[PDB]
Amino acid sequence: NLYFQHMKHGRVFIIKSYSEDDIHRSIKYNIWCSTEHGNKRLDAAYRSMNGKGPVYLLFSVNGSGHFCGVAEMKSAVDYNTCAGVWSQDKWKGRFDVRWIFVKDVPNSQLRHIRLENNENKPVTNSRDTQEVPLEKAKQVLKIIASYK
Ligand SMILES: COc1cc(=O)[nH]c(=O)[nH]1
């Protein structure tokens, strides 16, 4: 395929959101924020990457039945930022992202990809900041990229 053929390094995480408004804001301003635990997981992966490869994020709104696109993580986490900018006050902090695809892809197109690090559960059954093994992540990314 033409998409993601060169991604020898780097790491891929599921992002789950309770709020489609939060996603809209993320797309508009190219920023995101997770829980404290999820921020720490993404921060560790971004920093240990040391710019050697991409950290990609596969976004999905809880209950929507579809993934809604792909962004690249673009900064470390900043834990002390303006409160109350998201749909709930409980999302504290900020990191930069760069959205690559904004498009709805039905879970039917992805649910036969299983995560060997998550009890072989479908990737579509992941929780927020579930890490995706690199070879399964390539499959997901190419399906999203090419979907029509
Ligand atoms: C950044 O805004 C959100 C982050 C999250 O992890 N879940 C949400 O519903 N919104």
Curated annotation (Swiss-Prot):
The disordered regions have the ability to interact with each other and to 'phase separate' into liquid droplets within the cytosol following binding to mRNAs containing multiple m6A-modified residues. This leads to the partition of m6A-containing mRNAs into membraneless compartments, where mRNAs may be stored, degraded or used to transport mRNAs to dendritic arbors in neurons. Residues 8-148 are annotated as: Interaction with m6A-containing mRNAs. Changing residue 127 to A: Decreased binding to RNAs. Highly expressed in induced pluripotent stem cells (iPSCs) and down-regulated during neural differentiation. This is YTH domain-containing family protein 2. The gene is YTHDF2. The chain holds residues 408 to 548 of 579 of the full protein. Belongs to the YTHDF family. YTHDF2 subfamily. Ubiquitinated by the SCF(SKP2) complex, leading to its degradation. RNA binds at residues 16-18, 22, 32-33, 62, 86, 91. Residues 10-144 form the YTH domain. It comes from the Eukaryota. Specifically recognizes and binds N6-methyladenosine (m6A)-containing RNAs, and regulates their stability. M6A is a modification present at internal sites of mRNAs and some non-coding RNAs and plays a role in mRNA stability and processing. Acts as a regulator of mRNA stability by promoting degradation of m6A-containing mRNAs via interaction with the CCR4-NOT and ribonuclease P/MRP complexes, depending on the context. The YTHDF paralogs (YTHDF1, YTHDF2 and YTHDF3) share m6A-containing mRNAs targets and act redundantly to mediate mRNA degradation and cellular differentiation. (Microbial infection) Promotes viral gene expression and replication of polyomavirus SV40: acts by binding to N6-methyladenosine (m6A)-containing viral RNAs. Interacts with CNOT1; interaction is direct and promotes recruitment of the CCR4-NOT complex. Interacts with YTHDF3. Interacts with RIDA/HRSP12; interaction leads to recruitment of the ribonuclease P/MRP complex. Induction: Following heat shock stress. It is found in: Cytoplasm, Cytosol; Cytoplasm, P-body; Cytoplasm, Stress granule; Nucleus.
